[PDB]
Amino acid sequence: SLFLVGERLNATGSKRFREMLFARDLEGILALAREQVEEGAHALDLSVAWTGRDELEDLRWLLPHLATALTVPVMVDSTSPEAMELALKYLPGRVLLNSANLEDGLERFDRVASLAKAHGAALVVLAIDEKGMAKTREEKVRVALRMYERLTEHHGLRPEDLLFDLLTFPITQGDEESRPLAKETLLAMEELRERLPGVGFVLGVSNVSFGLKPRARRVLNSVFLDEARKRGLTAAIVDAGKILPISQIPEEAYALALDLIYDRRKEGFDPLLAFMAYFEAH
Numbered sequence: 349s350l351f352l353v354g355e356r357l358n359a360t361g362s363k364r365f366r367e368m369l370f371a372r373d374l375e376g377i378l379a380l381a382r383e384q385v386e387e388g389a390h391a392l393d394l395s396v397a398w399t400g401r402d403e404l405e406d407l408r409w410l411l412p413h414l415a416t417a418l419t420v421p422v423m424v425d426s427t428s429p430e431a432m433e434l435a436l437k438y439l440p441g442r443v444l445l446n447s448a449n450l451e452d453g454l455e456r457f458d459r460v461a462s463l464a465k466a467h468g469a470a471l472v473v474l475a476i477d478e479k480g481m482a483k484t485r486e487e488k489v490r491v492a493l494r495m496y497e498r499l500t501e502h503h504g505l506r507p508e509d510l511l512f513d514l515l516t517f518p519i520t521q522g523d524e525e526s527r528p529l530a531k532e533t534l535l536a537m538e539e540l541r542e543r544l545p546g547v548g549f550v551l552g553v554s555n556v557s558f559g560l561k562p563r564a565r566r567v568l569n570s571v572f573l574d575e576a577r578k579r580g581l582t583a584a585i586v587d588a589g590k591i592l593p594i595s596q597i598p599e600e601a602y603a604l605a606l607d608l609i610y611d612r613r614k615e616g617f618d619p620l621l622a623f624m625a626y627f628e629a630h
């Protein structure tokens with residue numbers, strides 16, 4: 349029952365999408381969208397932002413065609429409020445806004461939230477404020493509660509309209525700061541599920557595994573998605589066709605994945621190395 353959001357219509361995140369976007373290969377882009385929907389996607393993340401390129405021009409071109417060719421809703425992945433308003437114009441009732449945050453302060457947070465409210469769009473909110481990204485359990489809860497209060501009391505948004513993104517960081521560099529980061533998000537999600545009944549939770553699941561070989565990313569992403577579902581995850585941004593059921597993951601790979609996610613270091617044992625070692629050997 350997870351709302352799966354296809355991740356691959358993303359210029360920075362997909363070479364295939366980027367090349368087609370740049371060449372205005374509309375039918376290639378629609379073919380990529382349909383593949384994702386057939387592989388399980390109930391919605392599609394759309395991030396066309398690319399440095400030194402015009403986001404609004406790309407969106408003005410693509411969005412009208414997405415409105416007629418797709419049935420599934422679009423999650424508009426942008427930090428530009430004008431980009432969000434284009435999507436809201438061309439896809440009325442078929443938009444999730446990704447995202448609002450508090451890094452720019454309250455007025456900017458309020459401007460994005462007002463769009464969600466005025467247009468009846470679902471709203472993603474990141475655990476990010478004026479001091480930056482929430483990496484610990486404690487920071488995530490603090491930022492989330494501040495946002496929830498504003499979203500409900502001031503904008504009159506319903507818990508059910510909200511998707512809290514408590515942030516997915518790679519646990520693959522192996523430095524002391526990044527090792528616990530997936531565990532910290534999982535724990536914050538369980539706590540906020542109790543504190544904020546009725547709110548959705550979303551994660552960019554693929555970020556947890558950056559740097560590893562593709563077969564290893566597939567396993568780690570799937571295990572992390574599964575763990576998150578148990579903590580209360582309601583939606584996920586994923587490569588729709590590369591989510592394995594837990595039962596298809598070999599027992600040793602599964603156990604090493606959980607060790608890596610929960611940072612189960614001991615004397616002789618580095619889970620990062622052991623997880624990487626498994627995929628060379630098998």
Ligand SMILES: CN1c2c(nc(N)[nH]c2=O)NC[C@@H]1CNc1ccc(C(=O)N[C@@H](CCC(=O)O)C(=O)O)cc1
Nearest residue numbers: 355358361362363364446472513516551552554555585
């Ligand atoms: C940070 N992400 C994220 C978000 N939005 C929210 N709300 N939360 C998030 O965590 N939007 C973008 C990204 C999620 N999307 C993606 C998309 C692709 C890849 C990715 O790993 N791409 C591969 C593909 C390479 C290719 O085929 O070109 C890569 O290695 O970059 C990761 C995350």
Ligand SMILES: [Cl-]
Nearest residue numbers: 452455456459
């Ligand atoms: Cl502003």
Ligand code: NA
Nearest residue numbers: 359360361395
């Ligand atoms: Na992007």
Ligand code: NA
Nearest residue numbers: 453454455478
């Ligand atoms: Na402020």
Ligand code: NA
Nearest residue numbers: 452455456459
């Ligand atoms: Na402002």
